[PDB]
């Protein structure tokens, strides 16, 4: 268990030379992709991407398919509306992005909800934390906000985020408990790479962990070290787990002063690593 989330991501990209926007939708429980829809794919169905969702019946897949196609048409209409709001030509390609979802705490009760929309990579309109009000980034979005406040939109979203979203999240967590409620602590090790005859890189690896949230920090003689350090962005392994590393350049022979510290939900106490 622990705290958990369900999130849906949507991207629509207009194709002015010919045809409808490219539309891609993905659903996640925590950091696990479990459904997808791609307008360019052959099935034209919401498709499973985790074993525990495949047990849902045909009414589930028919319903999710209908709703995700309805999402795509909303985005198609929005792309046309926004072109007019911003007085842009019909010749350029533009993007709309949407994300919404809910978080639950350790007791699996509703913690927060969100629903955010972007146009051409910038905030457009977002539901506030109260699930009642709207943040509009500019005057175009202010027009949308006035429309949505008159049409009870935030009420419908709040009811979904606090009700349906949390209830189905709990169902998924149960059905997928074998993986969704398992934490994969990072498999850690340290490598050594000379950079001259008298300095070397120490690289501290965290491999095959889940969920993706992690902290790697270097210390020298028990104090935090950022000088001459490098930390890469957490990256997917391709099998559902994640990878990260942090590195520091040190004078050769002084490696024992340096310790790498790893914090992760799957670790009851943080790990400390030191070169041989």
């Amino acid at each position: 268990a622990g705290s958990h989330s369900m999130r849906y991501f949507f991207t629509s990209v207009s194709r002015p030379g010919r045809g409808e926007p490219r539309f891609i939708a993905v659903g996640y429980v925590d950091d696990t992709q479990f459904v997808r829809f791609d307008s360019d794919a052959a099935s034209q169905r919401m498709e499973p991407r985790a074993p525990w969702i495949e047990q849902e019946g045909p009414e589930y897949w028919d319903g999710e398919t209908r709703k995700v196609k309805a999402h795509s048409q909303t985005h198609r209409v929005d792309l046309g509306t926004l072109r007019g709001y911003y007085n842009q030509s019909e010749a350029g390609s533009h993007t709309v992005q949407r994300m919404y979802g809910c978080d639950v705490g350790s007791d699996w009760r509703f913690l927060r909800g969100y629903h955010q929309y972007a146009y051409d990579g910038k905030d457009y309109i977002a539901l506030k934390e109260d699930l009642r009000s709207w943040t509009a980034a500019d005057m175009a979005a202010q027009t949308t906000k006035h429309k949505w406040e008159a049409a009870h939109v935030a009420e419908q979203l709040r009811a979904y985020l606090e009700g349906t979203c949390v209830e189905w999240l709990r169902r998924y967590l149960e059905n997928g408990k074998e993986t969704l409620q398992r934490t994969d602590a990072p498999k850690t090790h340290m490598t050594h790479h000379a950079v001259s005859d008298h300095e070397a890189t120490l690289r501290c690896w965290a491999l095959s962990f889940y969920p993706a949230e992690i902290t790697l920090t270097w210390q020298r003689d028990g104090e935090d070290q950022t000088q001459d350090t490098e930390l890469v962005e957490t990256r997917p392994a391709g099998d559902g787990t994640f990878q990260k590393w942090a590195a520091v350049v040190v004078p050769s022979g002084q490696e024992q002063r340096y310790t790498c510290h790893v914090q992760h939900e799957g670790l009851p106490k943080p790990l400390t690593l030191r070169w041989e």
Binding site: V68, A70, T74, D78, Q156, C165
Partner: peptide
């Protein structure tokens, strides 16, 4: 599951 709303902007 997805929500069943998506009002237009």
């Amino acid at each position: 599951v997805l929500n069943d709303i998506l009002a237009r902007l």
